[PDB]
Amino acid sequence: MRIGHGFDVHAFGGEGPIIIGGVRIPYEKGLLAHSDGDVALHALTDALLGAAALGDIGKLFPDTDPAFKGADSRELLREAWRRIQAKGYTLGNVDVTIIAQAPKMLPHIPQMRVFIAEDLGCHMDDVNVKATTTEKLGFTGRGEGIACEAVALLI
Amino acid sequence: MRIGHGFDVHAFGGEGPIIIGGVRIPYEKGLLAHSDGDVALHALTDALLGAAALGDIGKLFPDTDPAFKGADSRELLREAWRRIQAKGYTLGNVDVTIIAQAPKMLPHIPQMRVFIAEDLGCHMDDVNVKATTTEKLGFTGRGEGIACEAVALLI
Amino acid sequence: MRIGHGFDVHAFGGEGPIIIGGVRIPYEKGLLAHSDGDVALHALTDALLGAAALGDIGKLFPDTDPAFKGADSRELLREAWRRIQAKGYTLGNVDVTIIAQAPKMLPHIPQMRVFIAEDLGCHMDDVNVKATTTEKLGFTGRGEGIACEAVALLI
Ligand SMILES: [Zn+2]
């Protein structure tokens, strides 16, 4: 069994909605990024790559490479997962923590769990996503961006 | 074995002391929250709920529900744990990281470990709590609030 | 199997280079600290101590103790590891996440993995280090300091 950890942040910018955990969540502003800026999945991705000792998403899919511009993060999640399984690993379970003052993630978590579980080909019970606020404190507290953390256990 | 991760932040406000890890720590200002605002235990709670795939504390005990106003977080910790065990899980071990510029957590960690170990009905050796500063950097660095992180492994 | 988590931050100050993961990385400014201020290794250290239920680096090697002034963090990593093994633990694997806007950590990760793997006496495949930016957001985003997170699994 191997443990992995990921972390990611993206600044707000442009018009909404945002894409978090694969779900299109309506919001005033959107998120600035080379890909779709899905903070939730980038963190999950790194956590998986991390546990598999495959590095990180920024080594696998560079900002530099314009092929990744506008990239659907689920697409990136599946590839990393493809490569992870190839190295011989299987999913133990994953946990994700979105840190944002707004929008409300809560109602969207189930659909997120559906997308992720599909993408990893695991049962939803092996996928958990949760959310928290920094109580107005911080760049997140000030609504300047959204951060996310994730842990994974591969077998 | 399942892995979980939690994270929480609370802003300073009012008069002290604060309650971190169940311990009443003397401080100038206190912590703003719907419950007792015990950052340490909320993070631990989510980490456990997370590993058990039971969501998060904000789904289990809403800000909205006035029954939780002033709630003793150990009380919330025990319930989540009750439900977690009901799902068939047992404690592997937990690790908590308090991130605060002040007050000094260090002297209080043992008592915190005593409360948590009791609450989870595990041996203290399965419970670890530590502390760190952001070296004046950040909302925590500026003494605007206290954040905490936690990881848990259920069996 | 036990899980551990660590976290650390250090402010920029003085002239560079910085020392992250044991590697001397060239940078304009350096990092302020009592030891060499190697954020990466302090976080890794706490993660290991954490999983072993041995507390944290600030309890083991105090700021107060002037013997630790200028301390090479690898030296601290090895001791904590010494004590950790003495308690009967062996390395499962570790994952580290450096959070910095600059300098570029990426090219240095391999050497970091070499130092850490040596220090823990494990194969490099059991050691993973990755890096991320807060996209200009935060004290890290503003280039005020560098933070790092880490998870470890002991057996
Ligand atoms: Zn990202």
Ligand SMILES: [Zn+2]
């Ligand atoms: Zn809280």
Ligand SMILES: [Zn+2]
């Ligand atoms: Zn440090």
